[PDB]
Amino acid sequence: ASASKRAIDANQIVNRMSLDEKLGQMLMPDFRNWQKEGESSPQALTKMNDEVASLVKKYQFGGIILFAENVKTTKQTVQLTDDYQKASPKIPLMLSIDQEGGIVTRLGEGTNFPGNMALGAARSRINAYQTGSIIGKELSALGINTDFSPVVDINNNPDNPVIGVRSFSSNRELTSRLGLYTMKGLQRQDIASALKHFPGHGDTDVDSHYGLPLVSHGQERLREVELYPFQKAIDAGADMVMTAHVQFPAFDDTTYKSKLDGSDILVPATLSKKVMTGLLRQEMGFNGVIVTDALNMKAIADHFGQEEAVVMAVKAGVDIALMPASVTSLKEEQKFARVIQALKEAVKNGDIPEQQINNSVERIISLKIKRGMYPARNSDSTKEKIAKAKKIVGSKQHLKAEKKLAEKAVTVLKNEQHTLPFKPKKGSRILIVAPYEEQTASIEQTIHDLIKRKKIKPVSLSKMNFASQVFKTEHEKQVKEADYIITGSYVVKNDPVVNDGVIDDTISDSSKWATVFPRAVMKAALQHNKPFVLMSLRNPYDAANFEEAKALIAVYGFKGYANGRYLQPNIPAGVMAIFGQAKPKGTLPVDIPSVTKPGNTLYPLGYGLNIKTGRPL
Numbered sequence: 031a032s033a034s035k036r037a038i039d040a041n042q043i044v045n046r047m048s049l050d051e052k053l054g055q056m057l058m059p060d061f062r063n064w065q066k067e068g069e070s071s072p073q074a075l076t077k078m079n080d081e082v083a084s085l086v087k088k089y090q091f092g093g094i095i096l097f098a099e100n101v102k103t104t105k106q107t108v109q110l111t112d113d114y115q116k117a118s119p120k121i122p123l124m125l126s127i128d129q130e131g132g133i134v135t136r137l138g139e140g141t142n143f144p145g146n147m148a149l150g151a152a153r154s155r156i157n158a159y160q161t162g163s164i165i166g167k168e169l170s171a172l173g174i175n176t177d178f179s180p181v182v183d184i185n186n187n188p189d190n191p192v193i194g195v196r197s198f199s200s201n202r203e204l205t206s207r208l209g210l211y212t213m214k215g216l217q218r219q220d221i222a223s224a225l226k227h228f229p230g231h232g233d234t235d236v237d238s239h240y241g242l243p244l245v246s247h248g249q250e251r252l253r254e255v256e257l258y259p260f261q262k263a264i265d266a267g268a269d270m271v272m273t274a275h276v277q278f279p280a281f282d283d284t285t286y287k288s289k290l291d292g293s294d295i296l297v298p299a300t301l302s303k304k305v306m307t308g309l310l311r312q313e314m315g316f317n318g319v320i321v322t323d324a325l326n327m328k329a330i331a332d333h334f335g336q337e338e339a340v341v342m343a344v345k346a347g348v349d350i351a352l353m354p355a356s357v358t359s360l361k362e363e364q365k366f367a368r369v370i371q372a373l374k375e376a377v378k379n380g381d382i383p384e385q386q387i388n389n390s391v392e393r394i395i396s397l398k399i400k401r402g403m404y405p406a407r408n409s410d411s412t413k414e415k416i417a418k419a420k421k422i423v424g425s426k427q428h429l430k431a432e433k434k435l436a437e438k439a440v441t442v443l444k445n446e447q448h449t450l451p452f453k454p455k456k457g458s459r460i461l462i463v464a465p466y467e468e469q470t471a472s473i474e475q476t477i478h479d480l481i482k483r484k485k486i487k488p489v490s491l492s493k494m495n496f497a498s499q500v501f502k503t504e505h506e507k508q509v510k511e512a513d514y515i516i517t518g519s520y521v522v523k524n525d526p527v528v529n530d531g532v533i534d535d536t537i538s539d540s541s542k543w544a545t546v547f548p549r550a551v552m553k554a555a556l557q558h559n560k561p562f563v564l565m566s567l568r569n570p571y572d573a574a575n576f577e578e579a580k581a582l583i584a585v586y587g588f589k590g591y592a593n594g595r596y597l598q599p600n601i602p603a604g605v606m607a608i609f610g611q612a613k614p615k616g617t618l619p620v621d622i623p624s625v626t627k628p629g630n631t632l633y634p635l636g637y638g639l640n641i642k643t644g645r646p647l
């Protein structure tokens with residue numbers, strides 16, 4: 031009865047709207063940065079001003095997407111979302127964000143979590159529910175009402191440069207289960223949740239932020255793999271689905287002349303009526319809100335005009351155009367007017383029937399009602415909301431949950447002869463080796479805390495940051511002088527130099543530092559009989575670059591420690607495991623291809639060791 035009433039209420043509201051108001055609802059810009067009158071370049075928008083408010087009033091957007099620039103502090107964020115809602119003249123805004131967890135988070139003081147592939151490694155679907163719930167509680171306190179999560183892309187291409195650890199797994203069922211539970215956790219907190227990126231960005235070797243990716247698989251494979259987690263979550267009540275700016279010729283082989291070079295390009299799914307209306311809306315029965323991935327991404331913007339992209343997306347059946355134009359000052363505000371006018375022209379000619387617009391706006395209003403955005407529910411003063419949010423966002427209970435999840439997710443891939451845990455005698459020298467200073471800092475800070483809390487004996491620490499470096503005699507000397515060595519490896523696409531199965535360690539410049547340098551540290555450590563552990567920091571495929579190692583773990587998240595804050599929990603969790611102060615329970619959620627024996631799997635999906643026992647979980 032409540033669903034029936036909601037549909038009627040949405041129809042009645044939309045029937046009273048002007049076309050300008052309806053088209054406004056279908057736009058969701060960002061105002062990441064803004065250049066006020068008198069300023070010389072755009073700056074992070076952390077506080078509302080009357081210029082941005084005037085555009086909200088004028089164009090009556092349906093929502094705003096927030097980025098990290100906009101949500102640096104809990105206090106400022108509550109003030110900003112209250113001020114955005116104050117600016118919205120008739121209908122409360124969807125205020126959205128990419129708070130995925132792990133390597134994609136935005137909240138400056140929020141709980142980061144270890145991320146989706148870490149959740150895959152930990153396996154249990156309630157962990158995903160907990161993650162969604164806590165993220166949802168934090169967003170709700172901040173006045174953010176929509177989360178563009180979960181990613182239910184299946185990372186079956188290890189070379190994928192944009193998904194990677196943002197995916198739960200290369201396995202469809204594990205991805206589907208964890209996606210469903212993330213979604214339910216968010217929805218339970220009255221946060222609208224979007225599945226991303228339909229119809230599946232997991233197989234791409236190109237990042238849609240930089241170019242237009244192609245997925246060439248046939249329909250049978252796409253239905254069996256890519257579509258599977260979307261279908262399960264749609265059936266279970268997904269609120270929103272975000273598109274992928276990716277070509278799928280098996281679904282739609284329509285071509286367009288590219289604005290970039292005049293060539294025929296296959297249509298991106300975002301602009302495909304066959305994919306968004308034929309497949310998503312009709313075949314798969316999704317009646318919720320379809321939102322584009324950001325339209326400024328080069329997969330779209332290199333190839334289609336700004337107005338054209340929005341019109342084509344709506345023609346394809348999307349309900350919301352995300353980031354349709356970047357307006358960073360009042361002097362550029364006509365970019366919005368031009369998008370609206372292009373949509374009006376399409377409605378006037380009948381290319382987009384006005385009834386299609388009404389149906390889309392009804393979906394948006396219905397979601398706003400369903401998730402308690404409209405009517406607005408919270409009568410607390412801003413000061414009251416701020417005080418409440420500061421006790422919730424990044425709370426100690428949330429940090430405790432984060433720590434437990436990150437520690438569970440750690441995956442031990444090798445531990446020969448009880449190399450781990452390290453049990454250093456007092457005065458031991460620990461050498462900490464990682465690509466970037468924030469990463470060595472995170473390892474250092476975690477060890478410092480272990481000493482302070484008397485969990486390990488006092489040891490001395492030194493750091494070696496190796497990004498863009500060549501391994502030199504000075505580095506070998508540090509290895510020789512160390513008693514224990516912890517090295518972090520960082521890869522997106524794993525691309526060691528390999529010839530006939532032999533990884534090339536003869537490279538003597540810095541051109542391949544991500545593989546050459548940590549292998550050189552490993553070689554020196556083994557030659558000098560030093561306890562050595564390799565921690566894989568981002569994509570776990572770099573484990574195949576260290577077969578010679580006696581100890582190897584994967585943590586699925588690379589962000590370090592900066593300005594007194596851990597940017598992710600994954601490195602600390604791995605360091606805790608190394609020193610016997612946490613219990614890894616992770617098993618691989620992806621296969622790790624061999625590098626030395628091409629075509630073979632080095633570590634299979636499901637593999638992980640008990641750190642104490644050295645045997646499989």
Ligand code: NA
Nearest residue numbers: 238274275323
């Ligand atoms: Na995309």
Ligand code: NA
Nearest residue numbers: 128178323324
């Ligand atoms: Na995006």
